[PDB]
């Protein structure tokens, strides 16, 4: 499905599914 790396909390229609990491900086992975 469709997953996004987000700096905020996942949309309520999305689930926290892991983290993204770029160059030491972390994001939530949020999948619909």
From Swiss-Prot:
UniProt-reported outcome of changing residue 28 to A: Does not disrupt homodimer-formation. Reduced enhancement of S.flexneri infection. Impairs antimicrobial activity against E.coli, E.aerogenes, S.aureus and B.cereus. Reduced induction of IL-8 secretion
Effect of residue 10 to S: Prohibits tetramer formation
Result, substituting residue 7 to R: Enhanced antibacterial activity against both E.coli and S.aureus. Enhanced membrane binding and membrane disintegration abilities, as well as further increased antibacterial activity
Result after altering residue 21 to R: Enhanced antibacterial activity against both E.coli and S.aureus. Disrupts homodimerization. Enhanced membrane binding and membrane disintegration abilities, as well further increased antibacterial activity
Effect of residue 9 to K: Impairs antimicrobial activity against S. aureus. Reduced induction of IL-8 secretion
Designated gene of the protein: DEFA5
Protein name as it appears in the record: HD5(63-94)
Disulfide pairings: 3-31, 5-20, 10-30
């Amino acid at each position: 499905a469709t997953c996004y790396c987000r700096t905020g909390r996942c949309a309520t229609r999305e689930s926290l599914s892991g983290v993204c990491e770029i160059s030491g900086r972390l994001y939530r992975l949020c999948c619909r």
